[PDB]
Nucleic acid binder design. Sequence first.
DNA 1: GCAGGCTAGCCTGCA
DNA 2: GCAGGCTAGCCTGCA
Lengths: 122, 125
Amino acid sequence: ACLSIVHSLMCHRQGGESETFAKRAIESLVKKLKEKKDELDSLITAITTNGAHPSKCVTIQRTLDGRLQVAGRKGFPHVIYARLWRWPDLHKNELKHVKYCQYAFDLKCDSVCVNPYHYERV
Amino acid sequence: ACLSIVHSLMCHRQGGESETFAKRAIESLVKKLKEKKDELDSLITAITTNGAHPSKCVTIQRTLDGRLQVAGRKGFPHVIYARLWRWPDLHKNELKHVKYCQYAFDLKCDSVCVNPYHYERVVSP
DNA sequence: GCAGGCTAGCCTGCA
DNA sequence: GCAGGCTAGCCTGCA
Ligand SMILES: [Cl-]
Ligand SMILES: [Zn+2]
Ligand SMILES: [Zn+2]
């Protein structure tokens, strides 16, 4: 079910993290999108087609400091997933959201867009 | 739980429908957004400020045929809420979605955006 | 567990 | 081929 989805998404990882961390990060994200069909499908089709066409926001709940914990490690959620699928060498303060993103990290909403195609590297 | 949201939204109705119809339409929408905090806040702020600043999509589940039933009446959900808060005289095929709307009626997604400020009025062909 | 109300989905009657 | 009406299924207020 989710295991089938995870594996397809793992095939697009850029190697900027260990296999165990990437699996942990993907499983965590997929579980959160299990009851959000449209957003899950937006993530899968944007990852696979390399953000060819505009995609919908893929959101998760924002924490107070804005950091997500995956396998005992903390980091910004939009950074973790942009590093994972687009920029393995991504650093701090290198991500600027696209104009059409509604839940971009910087907006400090209750939700964060972790769609890596909703950010451009700067 | 919170009927204070329904009351504040009822104050912005344009009178194109009966008080009873409007109350049922708003109650139905608010119940669907009860566990979607961001979407509910985007709706309240968009209505109150007359869509001054860009707002997020306010979505509900799409039915098979696209129509929503409220108080025994069926209609397109984006039309029902655009009539209620923006155009009381609104007719069929007079809405066109804004470029930044992700869940527009026309896209036939799982979800339908009912944010009236995510649609602009057009002349029917 | 139960009473009762709301509506998506299905069906039909005029067109 | 639509508009609109009927109701199974789902949900909730209840004691
Ligand atoms: Cl009204
Ligand atoms: Zn986004
Ligand atoms: Zn929208």
